[PDB]
């Protein structure tokens, strides 16, 4: 097939925006195979993303996140997925979206526990946008009616607010309350 | 349900690690 | 344990030297003599012969191991 | 609007082709015409990306505009433009081999890229594109052959023969890339004399390093000038501590491994 992204990546160098956006689109189309060459030429895509004057911030961040996913970074990839704004799709249920959501969930839970103990200091930025992705997953799970799972993720994140909202707007408040009571009595450790 | 079993798995994996260190220490003491 | 003992002993000798330097006790030319004998007896490691021999015999030790 | 854009591009390229090459305008007007046709290609089939099977005029338009943009990059000595346009040229030539006919003006430009790579000294990628070439074309063609023979000479070391072989240029397009190759040769001999040929004097240096006048080599002393020794010998090829702590770590680790119950 294309057999090389050299042409497209070299073309992206040119200032012509229209060209730049179309090259970004085609790179997103063919990322799955040429992630290695794209990796080699990330630098320029980083410039394209960071210079917010260019009106493809979300697309640049998304493609960078996908590339770093293919590489295996999974951290700067995560930040780029976060910077993709809302351009990222969540209901596509692709492998890439699913795994990045998993990374978001675990990372966010980590900062949640961290702050959980921290009385007020540190109060990590919790990139409100990361909060946004976790909330979006919350509503998607609510739509799928996984009240158990919403409740438990809320517990892990310490998000008593989301936990209470899901339990209240659950399918059976008494059974949900009994399940939550059991989990609190047995599994919960932090006093 | 799913998370009940997930956290049970957490508990038992941790406890199994504790078993590993138990047996290593006890093996040393038994050699002595 | 031997390292700890050596460290404690040199802590002691340093403390005494500090007392003398402050003048809390009289200079004992004999104890001095002994101390500068010790220092004079300290070896040289970067001698470029000692080091070659050291590497050679360490090589033999590692070979057997 | 497919036909509309097609005919627009065709007319634009016809005007360009007619003007820039037949005569030699070779003007910023030609460059802007290239930019216009590039913006056209943008919406056009573009790098086909496969999955199209149109046999669209994409062939004509893209191949010709890319080749012309490459030669334009050459004329302007703009290496970034040259490399990008030749990257698209590869993506076109080597991707859709069967769906496309031979590009009569392909081997010439590709051999010129051979010269480009040799001049930049990017020998690894040079050999990669060699091997990607068909085997017979390595020798049958003259455009392809000449850079290859020059590269063999350079690898051998017969730099005198390399310089002698300046004239034998299959196409005048091989211009100024020869000069990049020359100064790359100069840098190569510079490293040569640096790490070998201990304490070479000025006269030997000048005769061997085919620089310009001795004043120009005094200028070339800008190239870190070595030290010029006492007699402009350009200096020369410039040329314990018991690793106790690390070796202690190593042996402690040996004991640790020997010792755990595991």
UniProtKB/Swiss-Prot annotation, chain A:
Organism classification: Eukaryota, Metazoa, Chordata, Craniata, Vertebrata
UniProt similarity note: Belongs to the proteasome subunit S1 family.
Organism of origin: Homo sapiens (Human)
Signal sequence, start to end: none
Residues with N-acetylmethionine modification: 1
Subunit structure: Component of the 19S proteasome regulatory particle complex. The 26S proteasome consists of a 20S core particle (CP) and two 19S regulatory subunits (RP). The regulatory particle is made of a lid composed of 9 subunits, a base containing 6 ATPases and few additional components including PSMD1. Interacts with ADRM1. Interacts with ZFAND1.
Purpose: Component of the 26S proteasome, a multiprotein complex involved in the ATP-dependent degradation of ubiquitinated proteins. This complex plays a key role in the maintenance of protein homeostasis by removing misfolded or damaged proteins, which could impair cellular functions, and by removing proteins whose functions are no longer required. Therefore, the proteasome participates in numerous cellular processes, including cell cycle progression, apoptosis, or DNA damage repair.
Name of the gene this protein is made from: PSMD1
The protein, known as: 26S proteasome non-ATPase regulatory subunit 1
Curated annotation (Swiss-Prot), chain B:
Recorded superkingdom: Eukaryota
Localization: Cytoplasm; Nucleus
Coiled-coil annotated spans: none
Task of the protein: Component of the 26S proteasome, a multiprotein complex involved in the ATP-dependent degradation of ubiquitinated proteins. This complex plays a key role in the maintenance of protein homeostasis by removing misfolded or damaged proteins, which could impair cellular functions, and by removing proteins whose functions are no longer required. Therefore, the proteasome participates in numerous cellular processes, including cell cycle progression, apoptosis, or DNA damage repair.
Family recorded in the similarity comment: Belongs to the AAA ATPase family.
Subunit structure: Component of the 19S proteasome regulatory particle complex. The 26S proteasome consists of a 20S core particle (CP) and two 19S regulatory subunits (RP). The regulatory particle is made of a lid composed of 9 subunits, a base containing 6 ATPases including PSMC4 and few additional components. Interacts with NR1I3. Interacts with PAAF1. Interacts with TRIM5. Interacts with ZFAND1.
UniProt name for this protein: 26S proteasome regulatory subunit 6B
Species name: Homo sapiens
Organism classification: Eukaryota, Metazoa, Chordata, Craniata, Vertebrata
Curated annotation (Swiss-Prot), chain C:
Signal sequence bounds: none
GO biological process: proteasome-mediated ubiquitin-dependent protein catabolic process
Sequence positions bearing N6-acetyllysine: 9, 19
CC annotations in GO: cytosol; extracellular exosome; extracellular region; ficolin-1-rich granule lumen; membrane; nucleoplasm; nucleus; proteasome complex
Keywords: Acetylation, Isopeptide bond, Proteasome, Ubl conjugation
Gene Ontology MF terms in the entry: protein homodimerization activity
Family named by the database record: Belongs to the peptidase M67A family.
Protein task: Component of the 26S proteasome, a multiprotein complex involved in the ATP-dependent degradation of ubiquitinated proteins. This complex plays a key role in the maintenance of protein homeostasis by removing misfolded or damaged proteins, which could impair cellular functions, and by removing proteins whose functions are no longer required. Therefore, the proteasome participates in numerous cellular processes, including cell cycle progression, apoptosis, or DNA damage repair.
Oligomeric form and interacting partners: Component of the 19S proteasome regulatory particle complex. The 26S proteasome consists of a 20S core particle (CP) and two 19S regulatory subunits (RP). The regulatory particle is made of a lid composed of 9 subunits including PSMD7, a base containing 6 ATPases and few additional components. Within the complex, PSMD7 interacts with subunit PSMD4 through their respective MPN domain. Interacts with TRIM5.
Leftover remarks: Does not bind a metal ion.
Swiss-Prot record, chain D:
Keyword Transport: no
GO terms classed as biological process: proteasome-mediated ubiquitin-dependent protein catabolic process
Keywords for this protein: Isopeptide bond, Phosphoprotein, Proteasome, Ubl conjugation
Placement of covalent cross-link Glycyl lysine isopeptide (Lys-Gly) (interchain with G-Cter in SUMO2): 215
Protein name: 26S proteasome non-ATPase regulatory subunit 8
Domain of life: Eukaryota
Subunit structure: Component of the 19S proteasome regulatory particle complex. The 26S proteasome consists of a 20S core particle (CP) and two 19S regulatory subunits (RP). The regulatory particle is made of a lid composed of 9 subunits including PSMD8, a base containing 6 ATPases and few additional components. Interacts with DDI2. Interacts with TASOR.
Annotated source species: Homo sapiens
TM region positions: none
Family that this chain belongs to: Belongs to the proteasome subunit S14 family.
GO CC, any one term: nucleoplasm
Residue stretches making up the PCI domain: 80-243
Protein task: Component of the 26S proteasome, a multiprotein complex involved in the ATP-dependent degradation of ubiquitinated proteins. This complex plays a key role in the maintenance of protein homeostasis by removing misfolded or damaged proteins, which could impair cellular functions, and by removing proteins whose functions are no longer required. Therefore, the proteasome participates in numerous cellular processes, including cell cycle progression, apoptosis, or DNA damage repair.
Keyword Oxidoreductase: no
Annotated positions of the Phosphoserine modification: 24
Lineage: Eukaryota, Metazoa, Chordata, Craniata, Vertebrata
Gene: PSMD8
